[PDB]
Symmetry: C2
Amino acid sequence: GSMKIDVVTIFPEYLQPVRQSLPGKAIDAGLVDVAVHDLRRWTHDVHKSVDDSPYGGGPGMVMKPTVWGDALDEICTSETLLVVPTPAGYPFTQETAWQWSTEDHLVIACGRYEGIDQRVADDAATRMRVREVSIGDYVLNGGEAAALVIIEAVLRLVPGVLGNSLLEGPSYTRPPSWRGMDVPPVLLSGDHAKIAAWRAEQSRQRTIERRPDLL
Amino acid sequence: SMKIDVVTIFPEYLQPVGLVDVAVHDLRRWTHDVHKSVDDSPYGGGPGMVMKPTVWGDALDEICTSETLLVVPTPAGYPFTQETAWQWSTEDHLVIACGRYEGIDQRVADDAATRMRVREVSIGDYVLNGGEAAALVIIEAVLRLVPSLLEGPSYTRPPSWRGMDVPPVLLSGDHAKIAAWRAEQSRQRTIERRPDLLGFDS
Ligand SMILES: N#Cc1c(-c2ccc3ccn(Cc4ccc(CN5CCOCC5)cc4)c3c2)n[nH]c1N
Ligand SMILES: N#Cc1c(-c2ccc3ccn(Cc4ccc(CN5CCOCC5)cc4)c3c2)n[nH]c1N
């Protein structure tokens, strides 16, 4: 019904698409509020450091636990669901989105470099729900794009917020003939049992060809 | 070296973004009557509107060549994975067609598949409102590659924090023992979160 979302990142500008797809009606009606915070507001040094060399060697830097611990303490309560995009996470699916759609406070912690010191989430887990998730089997530069996906998948399940087993088959609209390609005639037959069956066969077929693992 | 064109009725979403340029094009600049919609009701009936192939056809005609790789995000596409990103990292020209509503008339990709290579892909098993978020993900996964197991936990300073210690092996400086500990963490994490990567059931 109602939901607050805090996003924490060192590139707040990458979250612009969210401000751009949120309807004013939902914000006015207080269905949703989305804040973005610059992690660097919680650094301790004049150089505004967020990253440091990894214990045990290895390429790339790791984000500092001290800075992240500062930010999460301020933003989180014991009622928060802390969401941490990560290339080593549990799969984010539609089931996940559905379950999170009923939460009242999401915090999304977007890391960069090789990620965030593990102690941050371990510590968080001793007093709030914490979920390490990945949005798909590919590698990104950080968690900001993942957050865009997660926020969208979830918010569109919250009634009136974004204004909206087998693979879906093909869709068709006007004109009935275009570049020598006619809309499949069954779709114009006015026989709605035949149409439903024809769509089901397309669906089964496409699913076999594209996602045989759903079977 | 690579060029990416994204075509969308929501160009303001793509807002933020040398050997590579990325152009965002407004599909509506191609409409035939400014007083008409890009979407219409679906043949056969159903919920939601479908995007007409007419406007899409004019846009892609202009923007594509026969060598163009045309990418269409769809919730019914082939899985987009790291293998896909690697394959696309060598292309010279990608055009990403972002749909909205219930999506694009199927004849667009079917007609395009007669003159160029078309790829219907999905970035995940979850539902979006249109192809634009997917295009961002796809662009990010592909560009970072232009010239097995899940990773375990990483740590940096301080060595103790809120009374949590860094795993002492990592302070040992024994490269072989550290490698071993990390493989162990990674296998453990993989079995727990993604058992399918090792051929088990989910
Ligand atoms: N959700 C989600 C994601 C993410 C994601 C999410 C969050 C962060 C924070 C930093 N990064 C970058 C990053 C990339 C790769 C690696 C590991 N490799 C690097 C080199 O050495 C070892 C192997 C680590 C860190 C992130 C990536 N990617 N793909 C998804 N589906
Ligand atoms: N990549 C990727 C994606 C997309 C994606 C990509 C492109 C477009 C263009 C429009 N949409 C919205 C859309 C949502 C749902 C449905 C199914 N419907 C069936 C009948 O009832 C309503 C629902 C169809 C269209 C898109 C979604 N979603 N998830 C991914 N991994």
